[PDB]
Design a protein around this ligand. Structure first.
Ligand code: ATP
Length: 542
RNA sequence: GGGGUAUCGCCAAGCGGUAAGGCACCGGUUUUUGAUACCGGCACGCAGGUUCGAAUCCUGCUACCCCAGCCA
C-alpha cells in the first residue's frame, strides 16, 4: 500500500539524503485517541517498521492548561493496544523546555525575537486580516539587552499572564498570517503535569514542534493538511537557530467518518455532558471506544490501510469500517446461539427433558472444533423467524409450514397462542426424529434455517444494540451537533443465549448466528447478568 | 491575500502512450446462518491549447477545504 509520502522517503533513501527513516506520533495529552489518530499512528509507526527505522511517541505537552495526566496514560495504552511500539522512552516536548528556552535566547541575540507588550487584543488588531497586511508593534525594535532582560523577567514570573510574550521578528506583511511575528512564548501560571510549577512561561506549538523533531533526529515529520502554512514557520525556525539537522514536514489529509465527530473538543463535550458513558463508550469513534464495541486492533489497521494516505479531503463511509471488522471476525470469531427477541415455542410432539446436539464453532472451519448444546421441547425462537401468514419470499417459519432449527431437527408449526392484545405467546409445533444429521426423510425440501436457544439451559443475557451516534452524515457541520444525536444509538434488549456463553471473556469476539458479532461488556456485565455488545450486525438483506 | 484539493455513490492507483483495486450497490453459483466463499456487472472539475499521443504538459475558469489563538 504505497502513498505520496512513502515515495518521497524512497527517493530520499535512494538519493542518499537519508540512510535511515525516523518518524514520530505526537499527540497532545488533552483527550483520548480516536480512529483519526489511528490513521496517523499506522502511517507513522507503519513507515518506521516497513523501513527498519524508528518511530517516536512524543507528547506535545506545550499547553499545561488543556492537558491532564489521565490522557497520557490512556494514549500510551491505546498505541500499545493497536500493536505498535515506540523507539526508546516515551518523549515529551516538555523534556526540551530548557532547550527551547536556550533557543529562544539565541533568536533574541540575533534580533529575530523580541518581547511584545501589546495586549492579547491589541496583537489581533495589529495582525492585519486575510486581505490586509499587519503592522509592526511599537515594541518590535527593542535592543537585544532589553529583550534579554525582559524575557528573563517573563520567565522569572515578573509579568502577569498576557502582559508580555516573546515573538519572533519576521514579516508583518507576509501573505502567510502565521509569519506575522508569531508568538514564541506565552505566560501561564499553571501547573504542568510533567514539570510541575518550574515554568511560568511555555513554548508555542510552532516553535516547539520543529525543534523537538530536530533534537530527536526525525527525518520525516508527518502531520495533517491544516499545517501546510505552518511549514513555512517550521522551516524559518530551523533555518535561524544553530542545530545540525533539518527534518522535513509532509502533510496528508485527515480522516473523517460519516455519522460521527472527529474533533477532540466535540468528543470531550459528549463526555463532559454525559451524553455517552465516558471516552470509551461503544458508540464513540475513540480507539478505546471501538475496543469496547468489539473492534480488533487488526481490523483497525486494515481500515487505515484501505483508506489510503493522500492530500485530498475525504469522508469515509461507515460501511468501509464495518466491512473491515466483519472480515476479521468472520474467519476468527466462534459461532454461538442467542435470541434477542424471545418468544416461547413449545413443541408438543417432543417428550422428556431433552438431549445434547453437536454444534460446530465455525461452519466452514472444522479446525475450530465443536461443542455440545442442550435441546429441549420448549426452545426459544426469535419473533422475526415466525409468521402466521407470509409469501414465498419469507424463508422462516409459517403458521402451517416447517422451518429448520440450526444444528437440530426440522420443526413444523401447527398452532399458535395469543394474549389479550393479539401478541403471540407460544408457538406449538412438531418435529421429524429422523433429521439431525440431514435429509427431510421423504424429501420435502425445508426452506430456511433459524437459530434457537433451548429454554433448558438458556442464559438470561442482556444485549446492547448500537447504531450511528448521529442521525446526520456530517454532524460536525450542524449548527449544534448535539441536537442531531441519534436517540436510538443504544437500545437495550433482554434475551437468552446458549449456556456455553457464560464462559465468555471480555475481549473475545463471538458471532451470534443470523444476528452479528458480539462481545462481553465488562463494564456492565455482572456475575448474575452478563452483558453483550453488538460489534456489528451481519450483512442483512433478503 | 496566501496555502491546498478536484479520477465511478465513498476511498484510491495512475507521475505523457490500453483508466489498478477496495468499499457500496446490482445480478448469479455454492451454502443447514437471507452470513461466508466464488463468478459477473460498476469511468479523469469545466474550457480551450501544445503533442502523432494528454487523467498525466500549458493557458484560462469554476467548486470546495485550511489560515486573522498569547490552541494544536
Ligand atoms: N482526524 C485525523 N486523521 C489523521 N490524523 C489526525 C487526525 N486528527 C489528528 N491527526 C494527527 O495525528 C496527530 C494527533 O495529534 P493531536 O492530538 O494534537 O491532534 P488534535 O488536533 O488534538 O486532534 P483533533 O484535531 O481531533 O482535535 C497529529 O499528527 C495530528 O495531525
Amino acid at each position: 500500500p504505497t502513498n505520496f509520502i512513502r515515495q518521497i522517503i524512497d527517493e530520499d533513501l535512494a538519493s542518499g539524503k537519508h540512510t535511515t527513516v525516523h518518524t514520530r506520533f505526537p499527540p497532545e495529552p488533552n483527550g483520548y485517541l480516536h480512529i483519526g489518530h489511528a490513521k496517523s499512528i499506522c502511517l507513522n509507526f507503519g513507515i518506521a517498521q516497513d523501513y527498519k527505522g524508528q518511530c517516536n511517541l512524543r507528547f506535545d505537552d506545550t499547553n499545561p492548561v488543556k492537558e491532564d495526566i489521565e490522557y497520557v496514560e490512556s494514549i500510551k495504552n491505546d498505541v500499545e493496544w493497536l500493536g505498535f511500539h515506540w523507539s526508546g522512552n516515551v518523549r515529551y516536548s516538555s523534556d526540551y523546555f530548557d532547550q527551547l528556552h536556550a533557543y529562544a535566547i539565541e533568536l533574541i541575540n540575533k534580533g529575530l525575537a523580541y518581547v511584545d507588550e501589546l495586549t492579547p487584543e491589541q496583537i489581533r488588531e495589529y495582525r492585519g486580516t486575510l486581505t490586509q497586511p499587519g503592522k509592526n508593534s511599537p515594541y518590535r525594535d527593542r535592543s537585544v539587552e532589553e529583550n534579554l532582560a525582559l524575557f528573563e523577567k517573563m520567565r522569572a514570573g515578573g509579568f502577569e499572564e498576557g502582559k508580555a510574550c516573546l515573538r519572533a521578528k519576521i514579516d508583518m506583511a507576509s501573505p502567510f498570517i502565521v509569519m506575522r511575528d508569531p508568538v514564541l512564548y506565552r505566560i501561564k501560571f499553571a501547573e504542568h503535569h510533567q514539570t510541575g510549577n518550574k515554568w511560568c512561561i511555555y513554548p508555542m506549538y510552532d516553535f516547539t514542534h520543529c525543534i523537538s523533531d530536530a533534537l530527536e533526529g526525525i527525518t520525516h515529520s508527518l502531520c495533517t493538511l491544516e499545517f501546510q502554512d505552518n511549514r513555512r514557520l517550521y522551516d524559518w525556525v530551523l533555518d535561524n537557530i544553530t542545530i545540525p539537522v533539518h527534518p522535513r514536514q509532509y502533510e496528508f489529509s485527515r480522516l473523517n467518518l460519516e455519522y460521527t465527530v472527529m474533533s477532540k473538543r466535540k468528543l470531550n463535550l459528549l463526555v463532559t455532558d454525559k451524553h455517552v458513558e465516558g471516552w470509551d463508550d461503544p458508540r464513540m469513534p475513540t480507539i478505546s471506544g471501538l475496543r469496547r464495541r468489539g473492534y480488533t486492533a487488526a481490523s483497525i489497521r486494515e481500515f487505515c490501510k484501505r483508506i489510503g494516505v493522500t492530500k485530498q479531503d475525504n469522508t469515509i463511509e461507515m460501511a468501509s469500517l464495518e466491512s473491515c471488522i466483519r472480515e476479521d471476525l468472520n474467519e476468527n470469531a466462534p459461532r454461538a446461539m442467542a435470541v434477542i427477541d424471545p418468544v416461547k415455542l413449545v413443541i408438543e410432539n417432543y417428550q422428556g427433558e431433552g438431549e445434547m446436539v453437536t454444534m460446530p464453532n465455525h461452519p466452514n472451519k472444522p479446525e475450530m472444533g465443536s461443542r455440545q448444546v442442550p435441546f429441549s421441547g420448549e426452545i426459544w425462537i426469535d419473533r422475526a423467524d415466525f409468521r402466521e401468514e407470509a409469501n414465498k419470499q419469507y424463508k422462516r417459519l409459517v403458521l402451517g409450514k416447517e422451518v429448520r432449527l440450526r444444528n437440530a431437527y426440522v420443526i413444523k408449526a401447527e398452532r399458535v397462542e395469543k394474549d389479550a392484545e393479539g401478541n403471540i405467546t407460544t408457538i406449538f409445533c412438531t418435529y421429524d426424529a429422523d433429521t439431525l444429521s440431514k435429509d427431510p426423510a421423504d424429501g420435502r425440501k425445508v426452506k430456511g434455517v433459524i437459530h434457537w436457544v433451548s429454554a433448558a439451559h438458556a442464559l438470561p443475557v442482556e444485549i446492547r444494540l448500537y447504531d450511528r451516534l448521529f442521525s446526520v452524515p456530517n454532524p460536525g457541520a450542524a449548527d449544534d451537533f448535539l441536537s442531531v444525536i441519534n436517540p436510538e444509538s443504544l437500545v437495550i434488549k433482554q434475551g437468552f443465549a446458549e449456556p456455553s456463553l457464560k464462559d465468555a471473556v471480555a475481549g473475545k469476539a463471538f458471532q451470534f448466528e443470523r444476528e452479528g458479532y458480539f462481545c462481553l461488556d465488562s463494564r456492565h456485565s455482572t456475575a448474575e447478568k452478563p452483558v453483550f455488545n453488538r460489534t456489528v450486525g451481519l450483512r442483512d438483506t433478503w
